[PDB]
Amino acid sequence: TVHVEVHQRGSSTAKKEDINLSVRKLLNRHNDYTWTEFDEPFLTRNVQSVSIIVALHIFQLNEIIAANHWVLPAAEFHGLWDSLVYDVEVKSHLLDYVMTTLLFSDKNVNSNLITWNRVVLLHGPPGTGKTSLCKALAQKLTIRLSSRYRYGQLIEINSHSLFSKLVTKMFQKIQDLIDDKDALVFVLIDEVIRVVNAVLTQIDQIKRHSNVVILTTSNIVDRADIKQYIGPPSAAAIFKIYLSCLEELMKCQIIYPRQQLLTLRELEMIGFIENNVSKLSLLLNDISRKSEGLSGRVLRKLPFLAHALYVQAPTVTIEGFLQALSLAVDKQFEER
Template sequence: MSTNETSFKPALHVECRMRDTDGFVRPDRVREEVTEWICENFISLRIDQRLENYEELNHGGAIQSISVVGFSGVQEDSLFHRLADVQLDVQAYMLHPYVVDDHVSEVRPGQQHDDELKPKTRTMPLPSANIHGLWESFTTRMGIVIYWLNCIRELTSKVSMTKSQRLDPNIVSWNHLVLLYGPPGTGKSSLSRALAHKLTIRLGKYFLRGKLVEVDPQSLFSRYFGESGQLVAQIFEQINAMADDEACLICVVIDEVETLTSPRERAATGNECGDALRATNQLLTCIDALRHRPNIVLFCTSNMLQAIDSAFVDRIDIKQLVPNPCPRAIYEIFRTCINELLRTGVLVPSKSNNEDPNLNMRPESPLSQSVHDFVLIEPISIPRFAEMEIRLYDQPHAPARKLWIISQKADGLSGRTLRKLPFLALALYTFTEPSTIHEGLYALSLAVEHELRAYNPHDTDLSD
């Protein structure tokens, strides 16, 4: 098959997580060997599949896991893909260990004035154990996730093209700027970090390392009039210096970017101070200056798109609304929380037949035989939506089914609120310790109703 034919095929992404080998094993060698092994041993692959029996490979000892993580084609929601129809994209990476206290840019003790004039950033090497798994918690298969798949695909191709083809930024416009906007608590900041992590893995062919730089926008405002512009310039000087290492992908995250980019017309009419105007001007200049750096991507988040300067909005390459999670995403949020409560023993699997007659039927019982194939006897974790969807109506009492009904009811709540609810529900509505999974789910359903009433005080009938 010609190379041209291959490059037009959609990509199937496979991630190969390596053990820490102290640099003895090169990721590109692992990538090559795993690609060859997959082509020789598989006809098709399923999204989310974990590949086994790789230990026999020359680099098998250096591999911790191999998973099929995504597909960049038209039918992004289909689960099975024939290798003959795709371009295999294997990435080998090593996670940097968990960092408890992120590095905050240096400030010298005892220098009060100096401290205030230092913009604060946190840096973390990528890919990082701190962020690992975050992307997956957002990208439930199908549903709202499609735009994230598009977003990562667009970013990957733009960064890789500017890096490999050395495109002239004055001719091909790419400002390296992504804006995630939407209501509070929908996961914009977490998604920016998750995107940075994922992008570093996916671009492992082009960049040997990655770095996440999180800028605290509040620290860019000084109480000394006229200093804010300088602080912005200072932070971008630091970022520019980091980008001198061309083998490193620098992902910068600026939360609440509207604080730095308030519309300059407002300042001109006297409602905003001149210092803010200088900060906005400086930021725009710095963004323009970064355009020739193929290894920088800037992720910004905002709750208020209308409060951002139009010249900044005009420079944005990828602008993505992050809405409240849809029921499938809500199911995933609740599912991960409940599984964590089960894992730690805060919740326990069902103990008696009283709660759910189907659930504890013994497999030996002839009466149970017909339902046994479908029934979870002692669930130790709730399955993913994709796994339980086909069996949804066969098991009216299964925890997964109950959770799906609760998730549909919780539509409209923010991701932040949803993450709090399972734990809060146990504190408010259960009286035994530990509670069973069914008691926990009943409590969660009450907590959701309570929260919805707080959102819509006039809506009294929330039963389904």
């Protein structure tokens, strides 16, 4: 189908019925695009964004010791999903796998006949956004399952538990959130003796519940029925990442004035020929090629370094910015 994500304003107390009614009628007048300004006043009042990304998901964002807790969908994770860029379709695959995992628990499929369980292992080299993808994935499952779960919960356990009871108090609090069966509960552990044994025993207990999924990451438990390698970005991915940063700096008028930037597709479409818009993306494509082997984490830090080291003013040109970024990629390599 087509998926339409409807961000309702924090302040709004309008019912989803009306948001739903009104947003379908908006889509009749316009037989993937994001809307931020609307003709109908009810929309401008109640709705921050409609986003083709026909099923509607309407959500509001929400704003324990040795764990971070978030009610999903969380303000902190808004845009996290779109921010993460992989060579292959890992994101759409993970979403599909965890969603059939949850259909199968719902309908109580015997896991002895068809193998499935509610634990996910993202593994691979560091700087890859494995933890951000676990968060991004929790957010998106929560948004897409509003018709089954009223809200979600995320508990990120700190494997800074190798320090000097505690564990029984944490999992008791976690159990209290699990008891609410309107809530899809995610428990996130990054990989790393009687204490370790106690958390592993506690995971085994909570992993029994229908509404619990265990997200795990490894820079390398052991029985997760969905394992997924997440590797570093290629030139194409690096181009998308950099382009999301330049667009964000033109949104915020740090890069002034707005110039149009072409995507790698859009410049394949015109056979890479140089005009006065397309030359800025031809330069990005060179900067991308000379960035390959850097992690997503370094890539999303580079536009900050570029600005701090090589751009004085509150504003700078797209031509000015790409010069600084180019310089920033060189400093990154000349240090390592």
